[PDB]
Structure formats: structure tokens, C-alpha cells
Scaffold this active site. Structure first.
Site, PDB file in Angstrom:
ATOM      1  N   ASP A 150       0.854  -1.196   0.000  1.00 32.19           N
ATOM      2  CA  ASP A 150       0.000   0.000   0.000  1.00 32.19           C
ATOM      3  C   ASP A 150       0.891   1.247   0.000  1.00 32.19           C
ATOM      4  O   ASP A 150       1.599   1.484   0.980  1.00 32.19           O
ATOM      5  CB  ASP A 150      -0.935  -0.006   1.227  1.00 32.19           C
ATOM      6  N   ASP A 199      -3.856  15.265 -15.082  1.00 31.60           N
ATOM      7  CA  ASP A 199      -3.610  14.909 -13.684  1.00 31.60           C
ATOM      8  C   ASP A 199      -2.087  14.716 -13.403  1.00 31.60           C
ATOM      9  O   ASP A 199      -1.687  13.762 -12.713  1.00 31.60           O
ATOM     10  CB  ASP A 199      -4.381  13.601 -13.400  1.00 31.60           C
ATOM     11  CG  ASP A 199      -4.514  13.204 -11.935  1.00 31.60           C
ATOM     12  OD1 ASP A 199      -4.424  14.107 -11.056  1.00 31.60           O
ATOM     13  OD2 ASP A 199      -4.704  11.995 -11.666  1.00 31.60           O
TER      14      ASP A 199
END
Ligand SMILES: CN1C(=O)[C@@H](NC(=O)c2cc(Cc3ccccc3)on2)COc2ccccc21
Length: 259
Positions: free
Chosen positions: A15, A126
Site C-alpha cells: 500500500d 492529472d
């Protein structure tokens, strides 16, 4: 484009949402991210494979490669190449300071990669440190982790500090190449400041001419780079250069004074 979980000899979840670093039989290490779990669709299932082959053919050294897609028992996952040092901001916030020669090279590689994407008619929209991935040799690859260019895969399930003012409070304005030039300017600031910059009171400040504080750059940064970031975040999009324009001035500068 198509792939199976059987092709992967071993895996490991991490993660940085959540991803799996899987070792593929013949190709080796790859990153995997499951987009959505549930029933197998019909209206948009055919397009998700076409959208992957469209991104898979974006083949450039400074652009992240979509290696494939995994569809099996109501699960949908994307498979990209592994970048060992994570993202630009992870690299910039480390114990040791990255050399100015390596930072100058990152900048040139982001320019090369963005000129490629623009030349293929792809606007990023982005662009931020989090979408600039770094390998163990400090070379970068521009990603699309927020699915900004994957409009189908985005529908299957963000940061305003890098967003150009023309798109702040005008969400219908079509993004252009100059939109990404503004974002790159804020990425330049972040590279030399070594941190993220800076809601309604901010946003309205940015539209009137407010920018990240250049005096916050404590560590050394060249005057020509400061001059470049100021020009790239100019409020008028027409006043900003294009990435080939940035490249023709930055490459001679990098080679004479930084390489
Ligand atoms: C597994 N995984 C991914 O595969 C990711 N792919 C890309 O970002 C990508 C970008 C490009 C080419 C490309 C690059 C830049 C602009 C347009 C286009 O090609 N692939 C997407 O979703 C993930 C999200 C989080 C973590 C991991 C992933």
C-alpha cells in the site's frame, strides 16, 4: 493484453490505494491493482479491453507501460511495469538529498515523456509527483494512477495544487497541452522545495495570480529553472510554452550546466 493469475509464480501486496507486486513466469516483476469486484458486466466489458490496447501502445521510455489486463470470475485488474523507488515525492522526501544532476535529469525525462504524450494527442490533465514513478536507477516514468485518461476504467468504480487556474471553477473548459505545462511548473517547484505546495479562499487566490512561494525553496535551485517555472505557471495559457519548446531550451541547459 489479456492475462491470467496462473501466469504469476508468486505475489506480495503493498500500500503506497492497494496493489500486488507479482512475479510473472517469463516477463518477471509487475504491479497489479484490482479496479472492481462483483458481477461480470455486458454493456461496457467489450470496451475495457480496447481501452487497454490503446494505452498498451503508448510506448516510450519515460511513460509507464500497461503490460496487460486480468479478467476472471467477476474481477477486473490492470497490470503495469514495476518502478522500484515508488513516486517522485517518496524519492524527494528521503534521508539523502537527490543530486542536482539527477533532479535536472528527472525534469528532462518528464519533458521527454510529456512531449511524447502530447504528440500522440493525449493530454494528461492529472500531472503531479504521485503520477511520476521512479525506478532504482532514478529514471522516471509518467503514470495515470487516477485514471484521468482511462475514462472507461474510471467509470468501473485528486489534487488541485497542480491544476491550472482556467480549470479551477470552470470544469467545462476543455484541457489542453497548456494545462499540463502549468502542472509541470508546480512539479518543478516541488522538486526543488522537496515538498507538496501550499480551499475556496486558496482557489480564489490561485485564479487572481497567487502561486507556490519560490522563497520556500531553501536548497540550491538554478535561476533559469526558477524562470522556467514562473513562465510555465503564467495565468494566461497562451503565454506558456509547449513541452517541445521547453525541451529545446532545457536540454542544452541540462547538458552544459547539470549533466
Ligand atoms: C496496476 N496499475 C496500473 O496498471 C496503472 N496504469 C497506468 O497508470 C498506466 C498509464 C499508462 C500510459 C499513460 C501514461 C500517462 C497518461 C496517459 C497514459 O499506462 N498504464 C493504472 O491503475 C493503477 C492505479 C494504482 C496503482 C496501480 C495501477
Amino acid at each position: 493484453i489479456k492475462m491470467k493469475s496462473s501466469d504469476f509464480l508468486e505475489s506480495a501486496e503493498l500500500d503506497s490505494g492497494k496493489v500486488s507486486l507479482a512475479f510473472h513466469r517469463t516477463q518477471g516483476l509487475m504491479i497489479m491493482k484490482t479496479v472492481y469486484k462483483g458481477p461480470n458486466c455486458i454493456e461496457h466489458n467489450e470496451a475495457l479491453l480496447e481501452e487497454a490496447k490503446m494505452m498498451n501502445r503508448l510506448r516510450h521510455s519515460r511513460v509507464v507501460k500497461l503490460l496487460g489486463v486480468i479478467i476472471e470470475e467477476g474481477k477486473y485488474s490492470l497490470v503495469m511495469e514495476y518502478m522500484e523507488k515508488g513516486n517522485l515525492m517518496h524519492v524527494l522526501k528521503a534521508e539523502m538529498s537527490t543530486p542536482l544532476s539527477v533532479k535536472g535529469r528527472i525534469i528532462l525525462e518528464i519533458i521527454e515523456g510529456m512531449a511524447y504524450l502530447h504528440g500522440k494527442g493525449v493530454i494528461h490533465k492529472d500531472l503531479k509527483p504521485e503520477n511520476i514513478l521512479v525506478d532504482n536507477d532514478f529514471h522516471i516514468k509518467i503514470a495515470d494512477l487516477g485514471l484521468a485518461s482511462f475514462k472507461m476504467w474510471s467509470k468501473l468504480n485528486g489534487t488541485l495544487y497542480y491544476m491550472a487556474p482556467e480549470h479551477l471553477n470552470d470544469v467545462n473548459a476543455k484541457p489542453t497541452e497548456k494545462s499540463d505545462v502549468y502542472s509541470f511548473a508546480v512539479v518543478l517547484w516541488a522538486i526543488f522545495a522537496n515538498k507538496e505546495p501550499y480551499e475556496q479562499q486558496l482557489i480564489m487566490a490561485i485564479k487572481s495570480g497567487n502561486r507556490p512561494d519560490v522563497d520556500d525553496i531553501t536548497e540550491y535551485c538554478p535561476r533559469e529553472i526558477i524562470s522556467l517555472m514562473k513562465l510555465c505557471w503564467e495565468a494566461n495559457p497562451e503565454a506558456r510554452p509547449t513541452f517541445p519548446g521547453i525541451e529545446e531550451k532545457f536540454r542544452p541547459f541540462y547538458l552544459s550546466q547539470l549533466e
